Design a protein around this nucleic acid. Sequence first.
DNA 1: TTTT
DNA 2: TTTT
DNA 3: TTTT
Lengths: 198, 198, 198, 198
Amino acid sequence: MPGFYEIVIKVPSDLDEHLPGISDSFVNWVAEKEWELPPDSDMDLNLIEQAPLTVAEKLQRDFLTEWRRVSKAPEALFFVQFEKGESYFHMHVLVETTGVKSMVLGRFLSQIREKLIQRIYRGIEPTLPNWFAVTKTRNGAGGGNKVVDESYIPNYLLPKTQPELQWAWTNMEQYLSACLNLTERKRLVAQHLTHVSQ
Amino acid sequence: MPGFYEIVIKVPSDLDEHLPGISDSFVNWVAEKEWELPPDSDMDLNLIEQAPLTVAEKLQRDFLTEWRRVSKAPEALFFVQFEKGESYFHMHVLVETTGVKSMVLGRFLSQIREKLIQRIYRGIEPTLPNWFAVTKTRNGAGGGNKVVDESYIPNYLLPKTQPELQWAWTNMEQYLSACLNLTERKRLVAQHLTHVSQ
Amino acid sequence: MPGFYEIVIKVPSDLDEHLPGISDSFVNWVAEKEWELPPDSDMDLNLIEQAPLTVAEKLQRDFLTEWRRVSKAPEALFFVQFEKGESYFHMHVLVETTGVKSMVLGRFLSQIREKLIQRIYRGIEPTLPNWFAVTKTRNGAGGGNKVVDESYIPNYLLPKTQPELQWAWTNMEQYLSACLNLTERKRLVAQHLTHVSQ
Amino acid sequence: MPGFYEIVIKVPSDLDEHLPGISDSFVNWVAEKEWELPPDSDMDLNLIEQAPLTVAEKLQRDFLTEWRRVSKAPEALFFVQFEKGESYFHMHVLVETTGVKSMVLGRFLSQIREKLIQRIYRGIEPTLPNWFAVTKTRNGAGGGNKVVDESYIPNYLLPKTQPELQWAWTNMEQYLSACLNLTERKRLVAQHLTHVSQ
DNA sequence: TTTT
DNA sequence: TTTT
DNA sequence: TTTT
């Protein structure tokens, strides 16, 4: 089975310490974009933010479009998950490694970061510590890219629920009902635990 | 029997920390060079890289051509082996000492390094720590060149298998089947161990 | 009728004053390329150079490919002419204005120059005075792009013959025989003079 | 007919102003080399020097060997002439343009100068004003290489006699007797004058 | 100490 | 070593 | 990627 990558995206949450010299048009366009909830979900109307989700969905859509334009393959699997943190809001992704190798991944990631800066931030570099970086295999000096197998999502992304879990955009067929429903996620976690117990 | 030399070559694996200011033509020509596997081998389709092997074969071919042009002898024995490492990818070579002495070897190695920089990197000096250096006999100050006898390959290059072993280019007659097959390598290792046990 | 643009390209002719620090691979590839003459031409074997023509044809082919890739239109009219000068060798072009406006032409020309520098010279900027520039309408401060109509080629490019004329690559149907033959060029000049005399 | 090049070489004539810090081995080897005169000549035993001629013949032999090694053609025409000057001794050459173009001539001349410096002076650059340079066509900025046709030798090198003429090394068949004999040179000059008078 |  |  |  083809491997997957893990790219963490940090979403800011301040205007007087994270985005210096911000404009009124950006916040006016962000705040004027409300969202609703599907009837086949199980979330809360007060535990889900608006502007952070609105910018996270735009960032993930821009990343997906950039990946589809670079790899020239619209049928690319992805699994984005916005998980609430204590210091800064983080978002994980599971992009397949079909096409892109590993040595050229650095230049592609740099170009994606530059495009996201010139698009969302309109050419403004935030002062967040390593807000756009990738993980490695934790070696010494010059470690390779960390790969993601199948036994990684049900042990680090599925058990994460409220209030940590915010929104999960899937693409697989066996995860259409386990995106916003906690019962399907718990069933999948139990199935994985019973499978790995053999 | 004539001795052999051991020259280690370090292959980079990053574009935003190893090759500053890398043009797009180089990576476009490197990524657009796929390779296949021979039917008389025993490797894996996922444990073998593409771009690292593609640049390593080009580097070893350039080194062989430069050695044949300098020594003016096309019948030169060689044994290149690309071994995977923890920090950086390394490649060992076993070039015979027919023609070149030892004092002039430094200038020849410097010229070969300059030619490889002006050819592969097109006049770009990488920031890798001692990426192009030779080994010595480990003495005090001003040690001689380390020679390689016959009892060196089956104890440091043959036991190295997957996932450390990537590709082994041979030239001898008794090593044609022990290049990509693990059974022949194990048989040769056992034969050497039984021979040195007397 | 759609207008045309006039972009002058300067070709160097020195290695110890124009291209500081040039590798031997470039000159080795340039010197190993010989061209012949078609039987339906009328030129000289001594008045036509080799390396300047060989680099000019490559530059014009790269420019045509870049224009076809940017404008996304392979059916683009062009008329390149390499004219010998007293100070530096110059080459004129007649690219149609189908697709590209005038305000975005500056960024496109800058990108084309950067690509030609990173491809031919491979990250080497020559010290020639304004070797890559475009002409204007000669006004005050902020003149627009100089357009080229139909009454411009037979009065500035057709009368230019030997030894000034080196090679003329056309694309029109009425100029297929007036590329290397002086009789057709003289006939076209006489026809234009008789037409403008009314 | 193929053209010819004109490269002027300046020969020093001082040790305490031209070659600072010169070893005694050079002058010891120069002074220990005496030359004679052929019986089929017409020169003088007092008007012909020894050390300038001895270094000029070695310089021209080294230049001829370097040209034959670079162009890979031993059958190369040449016509060297050591002419006495008022300021510094100069030597002219007439090397054919078979093989070498004009753009790569600069790098070849620089390499020849570097080899002559590292071989004759053993890596010592003299302080003579432009002692190793080539002539141009006298234009503005970026003039090409000055070519030498047939009507150039009998009007600038043949009339130059004693005490200006020192030694003329030829290679042609019609100039074997006009190398050291003034009668043949005068006859050739008269023939050229009668030919150009038509 | 130079066409070994 | 540049229309693989 | 600007009269959603």
